Symmetry: C3
Subunit: 615 residues, 3 copies
Amino acid sequence: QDYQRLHKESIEDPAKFFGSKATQFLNWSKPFDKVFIPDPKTGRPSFQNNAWFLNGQLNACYNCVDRHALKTPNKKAIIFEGDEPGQGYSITYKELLEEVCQVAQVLTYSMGVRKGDTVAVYMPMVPEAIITLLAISRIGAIHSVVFAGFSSNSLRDRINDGDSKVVITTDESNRGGKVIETKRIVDDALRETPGVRHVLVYRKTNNPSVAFHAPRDLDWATEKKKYKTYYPCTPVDSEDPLFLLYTSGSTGAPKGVQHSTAGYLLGALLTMRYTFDTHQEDVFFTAGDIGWITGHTYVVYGPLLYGCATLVFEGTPAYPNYSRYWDIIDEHKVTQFYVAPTALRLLKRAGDSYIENHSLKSLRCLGSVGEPIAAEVWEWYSEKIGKNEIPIVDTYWQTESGSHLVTPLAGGVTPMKPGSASFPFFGIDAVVLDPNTGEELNTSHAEGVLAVKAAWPSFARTIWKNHDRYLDTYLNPYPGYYFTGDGAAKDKDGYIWILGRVDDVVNVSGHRLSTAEIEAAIIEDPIVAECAVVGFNDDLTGQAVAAFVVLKLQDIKKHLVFTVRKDIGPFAAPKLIILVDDLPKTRSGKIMRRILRKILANPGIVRHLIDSVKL
Amino acid sequence: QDYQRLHKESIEDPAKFFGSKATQFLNWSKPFDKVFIPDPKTGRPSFQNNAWFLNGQLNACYNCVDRHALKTPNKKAIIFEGDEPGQGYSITYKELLEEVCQVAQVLTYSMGVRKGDTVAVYMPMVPEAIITLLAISRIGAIHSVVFAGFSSNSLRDRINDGDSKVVITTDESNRGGKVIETKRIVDDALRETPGVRHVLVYRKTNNPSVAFHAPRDLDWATEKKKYKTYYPCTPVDSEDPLFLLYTSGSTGAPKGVQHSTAGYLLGALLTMRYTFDTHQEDVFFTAGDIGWITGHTYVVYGPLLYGCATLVFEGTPAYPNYSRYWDIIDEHKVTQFYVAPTALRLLKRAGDSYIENHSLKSLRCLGSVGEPIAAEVWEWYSEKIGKNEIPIVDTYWQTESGSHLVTPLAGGVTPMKPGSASFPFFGIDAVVLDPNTGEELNTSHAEGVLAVKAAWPSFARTIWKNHDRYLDTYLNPYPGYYFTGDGAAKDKDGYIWILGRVDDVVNVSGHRLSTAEIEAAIIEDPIVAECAVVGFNDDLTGQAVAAFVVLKLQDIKKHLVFTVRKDIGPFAAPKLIILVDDLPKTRSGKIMRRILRKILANPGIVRHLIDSVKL
Amino acid sequence: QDYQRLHKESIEDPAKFFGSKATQFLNWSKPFDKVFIPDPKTGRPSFQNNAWFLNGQLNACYNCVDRHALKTPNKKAIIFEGDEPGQGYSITYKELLEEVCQVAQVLTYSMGVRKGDTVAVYMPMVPEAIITLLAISRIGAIHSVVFAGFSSNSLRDRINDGDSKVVITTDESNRGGKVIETKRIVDDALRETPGVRHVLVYRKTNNPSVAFHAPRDLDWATEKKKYKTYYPCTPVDSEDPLFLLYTSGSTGAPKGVQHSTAGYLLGALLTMRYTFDTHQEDVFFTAGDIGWITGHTYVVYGPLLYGCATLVFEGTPAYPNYSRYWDIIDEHKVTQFYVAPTALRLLKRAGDSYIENHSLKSLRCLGSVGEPIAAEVWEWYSEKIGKNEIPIVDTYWQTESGSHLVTPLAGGVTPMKPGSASFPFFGIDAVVLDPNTGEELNTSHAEGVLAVKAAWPSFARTIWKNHDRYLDTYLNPYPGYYFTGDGAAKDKDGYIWILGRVDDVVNVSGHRLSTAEIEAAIIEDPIVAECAVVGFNDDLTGQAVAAFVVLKLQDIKKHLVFTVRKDIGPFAAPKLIILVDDLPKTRSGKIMRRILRKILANPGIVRHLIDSVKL
Ligand SMILES: Nc1ncnc2c1ncn2[C@@H]1O[C@H](COP(=O)(O)O)[C@@H](O)[C@H]1O
Ligand SMILES: Nc1ncnc2c1ncn2[C@@H]1O[C@H](COP(=O)(O)O)[C@@H](O)[C@H]1O
Ligand SMILES: Nc1ncnc2c1ncn2[C@@H]1O[C@H](COP(=O)(O)O)[C@@H](O)[C@H]1O
């Protein structure tokens, strides 16, 4: 009965629900006055003026490190695993404290950072990346992480929009067995970033005469050794920005999504205890770069705020072989695996031969995030990896949500449906609206746009320097609710099914076809292992269905077409399928269908996709 | 007591014994009148006019497919395993039915084949080879299979003697990791086959501009897709030829051994139930090409007639490594392994390191066929592979016998002797005759020529187009009996020991030395792993013993000589041993000693053997 | 209570203790009159005139082979393992007898060796090396083994000093996967050995036109085949030399340490039964070349005298991979592993990944010999290899001691201390003396020079041809006792700790710093895996501490320095650490610190060490 009460308590009485959790899970410097700013029009937390734990003061880094060093100093906080097998090591909580303290002082004294500044972070998945981020919040600064792979052009714009006067990177990065010049990329970018005063560089490889030029550049080791190991934290208000995270999804100048401190931290805590049923002696492993909210909230914040161990792997699922991912899971007794479908799709390709010897009884929970997960792949995940006896939480949420939106509970929710994300998390009032006829709440089993009626604490507060794009994008499209950008439907039993962003929905003769269903049914064919249905500027017929299929010399298309009508319908069967080797994806994993749309196709994926359509 | 009765019932009262089994195991279109044509001179089935189930009508393909598709449509019929590991797949009985039906129609409508025509088959061990053969009998045609390795010169003669107006092959064949141009070989051959009207080609690799020329050549896929999936069978008389199989053993124009339909099919059924104790849920694996009776009767007919699953592996025991044979046995839970000694001789060389991890508790029976099996190799087979707790049937029989001649019963016969084939199968009256003084039946423990007193149903009926060679070869050498061509002896306890074809017996001073005993004792020495004793045009001394030994710089011969006298005798010890790297063998496995005789040595084996004798 | 009595019995009443064991463990031809020659000055066995089992007659080879062939002829004596995996084989005791008998006759009749001659042996670890040695004692000859790796210059001098008129070698030696020209090395050496009459060569590889020239050179196989398989032994007096073993340690013309027959043989027997608790059905594996006493006493004499099986491996611990050492231990069910720390140091580097699958429950005892063994390496040895449930005897002894000096008993001694060798063996009266103020016996817990008060039977009797060096080296430095050359100390509980040869002790301001403690503490750091502290001609300060550290770009030295003071003291922390890739070691394993001293650095190790000091 837990979920039924706890969720209603969080919806009709958030003050009591979150007020209590807020004092429970976090250590405060100054108690908060009010829990949230309501919507006077008789309502829950206001969307326009969303704000939680008013006048309250606390410190992220203090909650992620200090309190645990002063309790379980000898317990491990970070468990690292290099790109190469035996190159790992752990960092106790006591030592992380020391490290984050020398770095906090490096920032204040060597670089001149103050409370409120934007610190840009361009690093790979190594411990120093993590302590860097904690060092930034320890001093009341706001970190802005950029994927350690993005072009120097991407780096520049993000720093310029971010107001970042300083930067933090490495000299090079060995990924999946491939070195990557980051310091190089940093310099090309700084040829156009006027406000960059300093650049802290953590030599990871011992560079091949990599640039380093004046008092601008500083050495991580050189500077660290200068400061004591303990440094006092900087209290900040509950509603002061914790960080910024430039989301790089759709077209249009990247958005600097801004998150609160308390509110965001409480969500990461609530989701750890309920969603993953995390304890203190756990070993959480989130296979996602610090480049996206996944890595922010589940490979750094959630785990460290809770006080358990979080695993940092700077490598790839295929390096040095597909058994690698599972080799590091059984030696570290990882109790929490959390990865994206793309990865779970490539591992399922290599064959359960690499999973053979692995007993991996160390796991207790599995999780999926990033995009829809087909049923056969969910089953495969549930049986091969999970040895079918351990939960699987397919977590629905966004960079803006901060934390899980709708997800199954590792324990609270007894049942589970392979393509569903089960139920809305606590505080989230998920409803399905009619995309056409206003913001009408669809009650009976039906498909429509997903939204939340009231705001919650972990909800992003704005978009860096322009609260206008924020409103138009998230609150103006469907006045009164929050616009997720995705389509969904609740089955007879209430479960929620994510249809895959109704922005890529192909409307054939007024039918609106969501991608989730059509593509999953495709990939779920021995002939394929990945599918992507899109569209293009179409005059007549309204809009046709074209599928870019990728196999694992004739009439091979027709089959995949007659199978679409076999279970989905004849008005869903594509008018043309294109055979491609792969699909244009983001470092995150998501498939860029807007690229398949825009034009029928600049990475190598482009050209090959520029030809696989002409003929 | 089973064997004692059942065998006597089948000898003194075959009418009742086989008449009953005949109605039990096979589905008939029109009941047979008489069981067999006796020998009026008071006797069992006549040899000269051998004929069973008179006036009866049935259909092979119907008995191998239909009846089982209409009972257990979802059960697997063929389990394939490509030359490369994970390239396998299964064919249910329902689907095999569909396939064999489209192909039957391809033969009738696209190629013009009629009931009675000879269809030549030149294919590798792939499913299509199997459905092709079934397609041929479904329409009352007679299939003539030729080894997918034989020269184009071999192909031509076999087709010309066979009267084959059509052919069936692939474009190329990847064997043991080596592609083989078959379509090439087919074309060189058809430059001399005047009566070849059509050629059906199943593109297996997607050829590198392989020939295909006029309405003569037809595509398997192109043609198949044209016909419905169900096609009616063609009833044929019990005594109408099922197939022809050109035996390529001794010198002299290859013989087109012709087998009946009913009679041959009943033998394959009797031998499955008793010899292998096969059920319905079994997975039978016969490691022998469709090129010889072994593959006809135990990798196609026996298994499919019984209704279980038969495994089709188109690869080699050494590819991609010696563990391969056992890798496919444990995943498919093969319950019946049946292979030849040559293979069991090369696997025993690699060391029980490849058999280590393998539990292979899926097996229930082991079998040996092809040639004599030494004791140490039988033991090795019995202990390493069999984990000594599962039977081993060393099956004695020929292309002419159709089915097992003398063999141990997987259950019926409680004891077993490593170099013996135990007892004569039901219906077979095996006796040992004196090679010199007439057809005298030797009763007491002694060695002599093997023969059968009366005929049985699975006995070949003739030799294509010349019943004269048939008589001289099989029935005239020892009037009244059937001349096996081998030597044997029954021990005190009755077991029968095959001496290895008394046609290669070296008679030293009137002693007649069979090869079985002398060679087994040789190979059974750590210094060797294969031996071949023969002879040559010898004037004085009568005939000497020369052994071509192959190891796994002096006085190394003498040893192997003093060891021959140690257990066999000083008049058996060879006068000269030749050290060769290997021996001239047939695609079947048998060692060609008549080549070592003929001349002291055209494949590479020739030249090297042309020198290893001069010096 | 066993050890307490047995040891006191052997000290205050050796006549009864050893007299009884002497008749028990050895078969005599003529009983011995007196047990030992005492020191008239009221004492135990005299040092100056040490002699045991007077007037007694026996035969080594008879005690190592014969008696066991005439009891358990079918039991295995030698279990060989080539450098390449599956190239092994065993030699029963019956066959070893035959072999040692044909070789004894080869020596007498083909080469002219007589009782008393010195036979030089230059061979690798192959059976023939072992039978050669036994063949030599069988005829009353004295064998002088030289490492199959030493230069031809080393071979010459050892033969010249040895008086060796004959030699025994192979043509080449495949070691660790590297062929080694020995016959080559033998010939260069014999260009200066005037008294060499013959050279017996056992062709191991079948040479690439390797030299062999006149009646001087003889073939092992050619000669062996000439003699019967049984040949009578030659009785020799208890005190007649068994062998000579040129120790190649410190500087100065190599010493030909001469051992008795009976006395040495009894020690090897006593040490097997008590130290290793050996039985008859055991499989002893001593990983040490026949080049040093270890191989003499524990890979030949001890095992063969006892009547069990001894394993002969002619390969390297790293070939063909680090799992090799353990691969041969589980297949042969080795019950006794005995190796040197250098090896145990390189195997511990590869990671317990090669030890994973290995169950190796066949072991019953582990042993360490050669040099001090750090605690972490002892633990690693005790837990990974021993699966912590099997004893570990860190055996202290020298080439001169013949057999164990102070060691733990596989069973008799219940406790064990990782860096201790426990207690003095029976007959050995170990005491700690003051290096400065005379031969004062230190009683209370303190550090000093190790010595033995009375002699024992296995004690070397002299140094070939110059009993003068013998006295000055072993009995004159500390009159009355035996000078081991090492430093030690007994802890509160009596255990003895070897400090590492007080000849390499760095005396900083009158402190005398033994290497054992300082280096073990160093290597016991994740940053290193091998350490070597030495010194050099130092005027002021007295003598500084310089450590040559080898890792598994600044302030890396300081750490290892602050750690030295952390547990040992600030007056032990080195004044300078040198970073080298490896250390100059002897084929035995011992680290040559006198080379690091002599000069701050001819094998490749020299040059690199000649530079790693200048800068
Ligand atoms: N568990 C999930 N199932 C289906 N879609 C998901 C899931 N998690 C995230 N998404 C989609 O991915 C987007 C979030 O991307 P991002 O902001 O980069 O984390 C949303 O718009 C969702 O539609
Ligand atoms: N199990 C067996 N033991 C000994 N010889 C056999 C065995 N099976 C077949 N043969 C021999 O192989 C010949 C049959 O060859 P084939 O007609 O090609 O099957 C016969 O002449 C037999 O002598
Ligand atoms: N178990 C041991 N522990 C410490 N040092 C040892 C040990 N065994 C032998 N040694 C040293 O090695 C030397 C003997 O070398 P060797 O004569 O070649 O066997 C002695 O001087 C000892 O100091």
